[PDB]
């Protein structure tokens, strides 16, 4: 579709279930808490992670 990008999350490509949104992109619920306790409140860059 046209808003947003498809429905998959950018982290793992293969995931279209009850995921959550994020700044310009979606995130799955596994990848959210993984990337939350991986590094910080972000990536190494700033794509991800709005607060809960």
């Amino acid at each position: 579709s046209s808003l947003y990008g498809r429905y998959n999350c950018k982290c793992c490509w293969f995931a279209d279930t009850n995921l959550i949104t994020c700044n310009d992109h979606y995130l799955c619920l596994r990848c959210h808490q993984v990337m939350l306790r991986n590094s910080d409140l972000c990536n190494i860059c700033w794509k991800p992670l709005p607060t809960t």
Partner: protein, 1648 residues
């Protein structure tokens, strides 16, 4: 007065009869008055004039009464039997050796060569049967382009060449059948289309040719028939092909893929051991060395330099007495230093000179003690003097200073030499030709230093491997399944403070050999191994031991998200990149490039069913099993991990894709030439034999027999007979006429997405074809032998008495081969530029020329004694291959005669068959006795046996109404088209020839054409390029819609459309010109202005010729098949079964030449693809769009609705895509198994777009930068590596890999004469100089980085700012500078500093920093490795701009470049070239202040007096660079440089974004022609400096602002190059960089 006596009968009183006789043809020209005789006896007179000039130019007698070769040999007494009965123009016959010549004049470049080949092969057939008389024939043919004789000249344009055709065309009504031959011959014109003026006769073959092409193709069908047919076809397909699981595509699963991969490459069932080192013979040698297992030398290397300088100049008689004299010198020097010094052999001379019982020698060779002296006692006891008899030749025939001492003396002291031979007792090498003790530690346990050290040792070994071809290709040994190594070569490489390393071998040349690395640390030798390797495959890892480690570390750094994934994949990748380099093969390329198809099939959803049958390449040679295990085991550790497996899949995707692109580490070129020249003939003929439409040897002048017509018609009938409802799927080539007619019918009326709009009206040396890629052809060899015999057969006719033929004949040969640019120095630099195979070509020419000149002399069948003696084991049992087999005794074999069959035959008692003494300038009539004696004394025995068998007379086979077919003229142009059938053009049948092209997967074939068939192809390709250029969706020869396809495909992957990546298979051999005829026959293509039908009939008549074309069987495969099986391949089956003499010509319906009809098939694959878009839009809900590119396509199909769960109907896309594949089989387009369909990944021309951005290909661009070093000059390869490192930093590599490729190419120049230039190659230590910069800004940063204080280069930027502000703004303006630029530079720099206002205390202070040039008085004369027979700076490229095959290797290029940098290369004014060693040894060494900022690149003035003519400043070049870039980029270049504050910010390595090149704001606004008119108004008017291709007053305006100051700088300074830049657009402008390469880059403001 009939206007025939006007200026014919009376102007013929005015000519010059200045040669052979008085009136001979003119007396029988005055007599006639009747014009039928007056013309026929007129052009015969003019042709007699042309042949009479052309014979005395070659100095032969005229063939007087048109007599044949049989009666012309039986004139003198040489009685010859029957013969092919040819008429020559002239003949010489100086006694058993005859020159035969023919002359002709053809104006056109097309019909020049088709007469030259014709009369050459009419003469060269005559040579093969002059054995019965034993005469050596030499043929010569001269064709010219005019009648420019010596007799009457040169207002011939008003003579008979113009008006005899006027007399013909006027008085045509007398009987003559008038021709376009006589107009086209006698006139002079200098070619495009509208071929319709030819006659078009037709035959009974052409009507059945048209009954098989244009029958069912109609294309006027209405649409609602076609829609019903397509719905019925879909019903049949879903019933009886799909739903029975007979489709070709299927879904993918994320477990069965990797569980069939590890049963594909991972060989479980092989006995190859598990560690990588034991599997490869070269990779444990690298492992064994990777653990550690000056006052005398200066007195030896200088003497060895003098020694091989003596070896360079020819001094003595034979090429063994040179080696014996030189080792006598070295052996006396060995005895000398043993007693003088104290630090003898035991302490200090074991630093490389002696290795234990063996010592160094002349051309990087070794020879042992006690066999050197046993060899030198051989002839010094037989020949009494041999020293004073031989040192006199060095006493008064060299330069006679000797550069030597009491070393070269008489009979050496053998007494202390035995003390030498008993101190040096024994350690002698093995070099073994020709298991389970795993003493190799596991690679994952080695500390990081030893892994990097395993890279270093491979660098050093590979450098010695490439240097092993530097040895001379004509030098041999003295003495000459493991062995024991008496003498050998050596290529020693250095490791540490005392350790060494040697590399023994035993042959010379450029192919694979037996090598044996030792390791001699402190004089103690040590075994390390032995291996075979092909040395020219090892060019990549030469100085690159930090490119590859930083590459592997970058790929590891992509996997940053988790440790114990990058501490686990780090040694697997290092060993992968190490084992790929340690064994290159085509099998490793063909494996590793096939894993991107696997990775896309794992990424997308749908894939072909024969995918896993194409990924498997079968194995050889043991190590390939381990490289396949490491490939397929690196995959299942990136993907397929535990619970957090596919966490960041984009990083894993680009990681495994760049692992798959490590097939570019292995070399792109061929492993062997004859196996690929076979493998590209059983890839040419295997589709045609299976299809069954092969005729062999057509009659080739046009017409055909009956059964060849019938085979052609049967192939046509099988082609157009596929049935629209059967199951002959993608295996069999053809086309059904129903679906093709549907495609044409919907194209004619406008319903497809491309119509017949048709803007822009669509009408708008002598190589032979059998032998492609060879070094020397047959025709070229007899050209060259004819050249040298006819040249040096009259040199000592007018200058001597046939008594003077020195080694200047080799100078004739070498200047004919290598051209030019004297007498044993440039003869040496010409002979040291021939590759080994063309060295053998040279030797085969020169012994032939010497044989002919030995036969040239005159001033028997009664005494033939014994050429071999008739008491040995043979008389003529196996040397009967001299009168039946192997026609001439020059190619008599010695293979089964191994090493001593021949030398037993070489013992007579030195009779008349040998000569008593070796000569040097031996007269003719006794050459072959000199040659057999100089081959006897040589210890080169089989050559001497062949010279005896030439001497013993063993070459014989025991000899002991008119104007109709008078093509007997010099200008009657029979090879010109007048009529044409459907197969012919009155000339021939459009010949072609085969070669290969050396890609990285598999070698694609390549067809070349004759000169007459290279313009017809050009007509058709230009027509279809025009017609396709009117269209909208093709992508082959455009760029606008290629960027538009990229911009659509990024969006289609980022939104979620089904993005299927297709690839068609066998596009070359399966297409056919019959398909393009039947397609184009019923198109419309309406004109732009008036909309009238284009007459497509000329392209029909050319495509019929393309249909009936002929090719040539290559002669190297036609000999390698008749050698084979001696009275197992699909081509070999159709080579043995033919009951003709031999097959040589192949004609068939198929094959559509590879690249020959390329744009036409782009049209076909465009229109039929749009038709399949229509069918899939009709039969489904989708809306497709394609981007075909003549071989492959991409199709971005979107699905309207149902993006929700519980689909049950949407997941059955399989019948759609299998039906697309079914119809594509129906048209002709077969889809290959490498074609993967789905979302998440799209690929088109290898671009690989992805959800996030795109995937950068690190490995492709780095491995393209590394082995693409082709070398002409250092500044040429310097800007070449600048453009490669430019286009590879556009694509996301880091700056560290770029800087290490820069360091590699700097150190790769410096392995030759060049010391260091301040311009260098390219910028080491760079950051931001690539986005807002060019070549000028990188050289500017390099020169500013030399002066690393920013106090001296400033005061040059301020001067540039003053002159630049005073050309544009205020109160001073400069308009008089061209006289200041051209006066040299030093005073010019002081003049441009005078404009700013400077003191004399500082205008000479900045004039002091200076650099040594080597291209000051011109350019370096270096002769490079190129093919046999292949003023200022910017003027040549502007002359190239105004005018709008066989391959070679890279390591041989670097060896030829390093050999042509130690010769007399540098130039010094008046000629008389010198060395680079001579110039750099005269520099005065001082610590003179200036030389302590960057030493031995920047010198002071007071240390360059002795060499002062090679000394320029850099502040002039720095001022020139700062001015000429600020012409064309920025005013910010005049500021300073400061740190960008470098804060503690987020240190991400993976936030690649894209940047636009900012601040490239020029001044000048669209140049291109406004400098050519500027290059006359302020330059001196050198518009007439070779005024080629004018735009003056036919094809000018000007006055652009800054070019007055900004072209003269390009004109005089050698290496700015700014007008090459500003006449071109940028190549990237899409730069993609990191986040910390823009927060850590130098900030140079405009005004700050």
């Amino acid at each position: 007065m009939e206007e025939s006596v006007n200026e014919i009968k009376t102007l013929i009183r005015k000519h010059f009869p200045e040669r052979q006789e008085l009136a001979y043809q003119r007396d029988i020209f005055l007599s006639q008055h009747h014009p039928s005789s007056l013309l026929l006896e007129g052009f015969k007179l003019l042709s007699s004039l042309v042949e009479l000039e052309s014979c005395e130019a070659h100095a032969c007698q005229i063939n007087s009464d048109q007599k044949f070769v049989d009666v012309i040999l039986s004139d003198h007494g040489i009685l010859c039997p029957t013969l092919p009965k040819v008429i020559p123009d002239g003949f010489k016959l100086t006694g058993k050796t005859l020159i035969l010549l023919e002359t002709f004049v053809r104006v056109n470049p097309d019909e020049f060569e088709r007469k030259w080949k014709s009369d050459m092969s009419k003469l060269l057939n005559l040579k093969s049967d002059l054995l019965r008389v034993g005469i050596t024939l030499v043929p010569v043919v001269d064709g010219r382009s005019s009648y420019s004789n010596r007799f009457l000249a040169d207002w011939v344009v008003e003579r008979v060449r113009w008006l005899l055709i006027d007399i013909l065309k006027k008085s045509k009504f007398i009987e003559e059948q008038e021709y376009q031959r006589l107009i086209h011959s006698l006139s002079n014109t200098k070619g495009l289309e509208n071929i319709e003026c030819l006659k078009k006769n037709s035959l009974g073959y052409d009507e059945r040719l048209n009954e098989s092409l244009f029958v069912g193709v109609r294309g006027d069908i209405r649409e609602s028939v076609i829609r019903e047919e397509l719905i019925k076809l879909r019903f049949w397909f879903k019933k009886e092909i799909f739903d029975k699981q007979l489709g070709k595509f299927k879904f993918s699963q994320k477990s069965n893929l990797i569980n069939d991969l590890i049963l594909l490459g991972s060989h479980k069932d092989s006995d190859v051991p598990s560690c990588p080192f034991c599997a490869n013979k070269l990779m444990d040698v690298v492992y064994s060395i990777a653990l550690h297992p000056d006052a005398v030398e200066r007195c030896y290397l200088q003497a060895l330099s003098v020694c091989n300088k003596v070896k360079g100049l020819k001094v003595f008689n034979t090429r063994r007495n040179t080696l014996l004299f030189l080792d006598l010198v070295l052996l006396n020097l060995l005895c000398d230093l043993f007693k003088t010094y104290d630090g003898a052999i035991v302490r200090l001379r074991n630093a490389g000179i002696v290795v234990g019982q063996m010592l160094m020698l002349v051309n990087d060779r070794l020879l042992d003690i006690l066999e050197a002296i046993k060899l030198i006692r051989k002839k010094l006891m037989t020949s009494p003097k041999w020293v004073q008899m031989c040192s006199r030749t060095l006493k008064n025939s060299h330069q006679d200073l000797w550069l030597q001492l009491e070393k070269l003396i008489k009979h050496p002291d053998m007494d202390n030499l035995m003390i030498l031979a008993q101190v040096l007792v024994s350690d002698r090498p093995v070099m073994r030709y020709t298991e389970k003790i795993c003493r190799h530690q596991p690679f994952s346990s080695l500390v990081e230093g030893e892994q990097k050290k395993l890279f270093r040792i491979l660098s050093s070994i590979s450098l010695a491997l490439v240097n092993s071809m530097k040895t001379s290709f004509s030098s041999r040994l003295l003495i000459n399944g493991n062995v024991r190594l008496r003498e050998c070569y050596v290529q020693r490489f250095h490791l540490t403070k005392n350790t060494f390393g040697l590399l023994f071998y035993q042959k010379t040349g450029e192919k694979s050999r037996c090598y044996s690395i030792y390791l001699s640390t402190n004089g103690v030798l040590e075994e390390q191994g032995s291996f075979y390797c092909d040395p020219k495959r090892f060019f990549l890892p030469i100085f690159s031991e930090d490119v590859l480690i930083e590459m592997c570390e970058e790929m590891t750094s992509w996997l940053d998200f988790s440790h114990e994934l990058m501490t686990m994949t780090r040694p697997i990748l290092r060993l992968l990149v190490l084992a790929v380099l340690c064994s290159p093969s085509k099998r490793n390329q063909t494996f590793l490039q096939g894993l991107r198809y696997f990775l896309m099939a794992y990424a997308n959803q749908i894939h072909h069913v024969d995918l896993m049958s194409k990924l498997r390449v079968d194995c050889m040679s043991g190590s390939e099993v381990l490289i396949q295990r490491m490939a397929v085991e690196l995959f299942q550790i990136i993907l397929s991990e535990g619970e957090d497996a596919d966490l960041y899949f984009a990083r894993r995707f680009k990681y495994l894709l760049n692992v798959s692109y490590l097939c570019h580490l292995v070399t792109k070129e061929t492993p062997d030439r004859l196996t690929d020249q076979i493998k590209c003939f059983e890839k040419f003929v295997e589709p045609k034999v299976k299809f069954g439409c092969v005729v062999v040897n057509p009659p080739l002048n046009g017409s055909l027999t009956l059964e060849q017509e019938d085979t052609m018609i049967r192939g046509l009938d099988r082609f157009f007979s596929k049935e629209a409802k059967t199951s002959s799927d993608t295996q069999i080539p053809g086309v059904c006429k129903e679906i093709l007619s549907f495609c044409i019918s919907l194209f004619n009326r406008g319903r497809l997405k491309v119509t017949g709009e048709l803007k822009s009206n669509p009408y708008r040396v002598i190589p032979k074809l059998d032998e492609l890629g060879n070094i020397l052809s047959v025709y070229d060899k007899e050209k060259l032998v004819s050249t040298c015999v006819s040249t040096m057969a009259e040199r000592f006719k007018t200058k001597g008495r046939y008594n003077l033929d020195p080694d200047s004949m080799d100078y004739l040969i070498l200047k004919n081969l290598t051209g030019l640019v004297t007498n044993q120095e440039e003869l040496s630099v010409m002979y040291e530029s021939l590759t080994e195979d063309q060295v053998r070509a040279f030797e085969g020419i020169r012994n032939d020329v010497q044989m002919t000149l030995a036969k040239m002399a005159n001033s028997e069948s009664l005494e033939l004694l014994w050429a071999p003696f008739g008491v040995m084991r043979e008389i003529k049992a196996e040397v009967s291959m001299h009168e039946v087999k192997d026609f001439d005794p020059d190619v008599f074999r010695s293979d089964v005669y191994k090493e001593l069959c021949d030398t037993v035959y070489l013992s007579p008692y030195k009779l008349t068959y040998f000569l008593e003494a070796p000569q040097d300038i031996c007269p003719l009539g006794l050459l072959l006795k000199n040659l057999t004696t100089i081959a006897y004394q040589e210890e080169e025995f089989f050559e001497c046996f062949k010279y005896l068998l030439i001497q013993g007379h063993y070459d014989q086979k025991l000899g002991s109404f008119t104007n109709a077919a008078l093509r007997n003229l010099c200008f009657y142009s029979d090879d010109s088209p007048t009529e044409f059938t459907s197969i012919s053009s009155n000339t021939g049948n459009l010949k072609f020839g085969l070669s290969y092209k050396e890609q990285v997967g598999s070698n694609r074939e390549l067809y070349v054409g004759d000169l007459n068939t290279k313009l017809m192809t050009r007509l058709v390709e230009d027509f279809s390029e025009a017609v396709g250029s009117s269209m909208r969706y093709t992508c082959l020869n455009s760029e606008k819609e290629f960027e538009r396809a990229i911009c659509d495909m990024k969006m289609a992957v980022n939104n979620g459309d089904l993005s299927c990546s297709y690839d068609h298979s066998k596009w070359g051999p399966t297409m056919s010109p019959a398909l393009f005829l039947s397609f184009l026959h019923t198109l419309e293509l309406k004109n732009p202005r008036d909309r009238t039908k284009v007459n497509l009939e000329p392209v029909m008549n050319i495509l019929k010729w393309h249909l009936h074309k002929v090719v040539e069987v290559p002669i190297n495969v036609a000999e390698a098949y008749c050698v084979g099986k001696l009275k197992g391949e699909e081509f070999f089956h159709q080579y043995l079964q033919s009951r003709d003499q031999v097959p040589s010509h192949i004609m068939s319906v198929l094959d559509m030449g590879q690249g020959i009809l390329h744009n036409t098939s782009d049209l076909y694959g465009l229109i039929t693809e749009q038709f399949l878009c229509y069918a899939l839009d009709l039969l489904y809900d989708v809306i497709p769009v394609t981007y075909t590119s003549s071989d492959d396509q991409v199709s971005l199909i979107k699905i309207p609705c149902l993006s929700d769960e519980k689909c049950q109907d949407r997941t059955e896309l399989l019948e759609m895509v299998c039906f697309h594949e079914f119809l594509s089989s129906k048209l002709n387009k077969f889809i290959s198994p490498k074609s993967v369909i789905g979302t998440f990944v799209a690929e088109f021309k290898s671009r690989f777009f992805v959800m996030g951005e795109e995937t950068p290909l690190l490995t492709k661009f780095v491995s393209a930068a590394l082995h693409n070093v082709k070398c002409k000059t250092p500044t040429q390869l310097s800007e070449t590596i600048d453009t490669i490192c430019d286009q590879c930093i556009a694509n996301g590599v880091s700056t560290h890999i770029v800087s290490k490729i820069s360091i590699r190419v700097n150190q790769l120049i410096r392995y030759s004469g060049y010391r260091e230039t301040p311009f260098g190659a390219i910028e080491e230590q760079d950051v931001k100089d690539w986005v807002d910069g060019s070549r000028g800004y990188r050289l500017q940063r390099k020169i500013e980085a030399i002066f690393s204080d920013d106090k001296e280069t400033m005061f040059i930027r301020n001067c540039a700012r003053k002159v630049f502000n005073d050309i544009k703004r205020g109160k001073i303006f400069e308009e008089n500078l061209i006289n200041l630029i051209s006066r040299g530079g030093d005073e010019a720099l002081s003049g441009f500093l005078q404009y700013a206002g400077c003191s004399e205390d500082e205008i000479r202070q900045t004039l002091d920093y200076r650099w040594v040039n080597l291209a000051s008085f011109g350019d370096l004369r270096l002769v490079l490795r190129t093919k046999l027979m292949t003023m200022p700076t910017l003027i040549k490229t502007i002359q190239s701009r105004l005018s709008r095959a066989f391959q070679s290797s890279v390591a041989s290029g670097f060896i030829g470049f390093c050999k042509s940098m130690g010769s007399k290369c540098v130039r010094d004014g008046k000629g008389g070239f010198l060395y680079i060693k001579d110039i750099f040894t005269r520099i005065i060494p001082c610590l003179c202040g200036i030389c302590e900022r960057k030493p031995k690149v920047i010198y002071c003035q007071k240390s360059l007096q002795e060499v002062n003519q090679f000394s320029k400043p850099i502040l002039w070049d720095y001022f020139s660079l700062v001015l000429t870039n600020a012409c064309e980029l920025g005013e910010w270049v005049f500021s300073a440089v400061k740190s960008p504050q470098a804060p503690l910010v987020l240190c991400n390595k993976n936030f690649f974004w894209a940047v636009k090149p900012k601040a490239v704001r020029q001044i000048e606004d669209q140049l291109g022609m406004n400098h050519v008119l500027h290059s006359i108004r302020r330059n001196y008017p050198k518009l007439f400096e070779e005024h080629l291709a004018p735009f003056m007053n036919d094809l000018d305006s000007g006055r652009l602002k800054f070019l007055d100051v900004c072209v003269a700088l390009d004109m005089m300074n050698e290496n700015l190059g700014i007008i090459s830049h500003l006449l071109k657009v940028r190549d990237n402008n899409v730069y993609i960089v990191k986040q910390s390469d823009c927060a850590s880059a130098h900030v140079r403001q405009s005004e700050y």
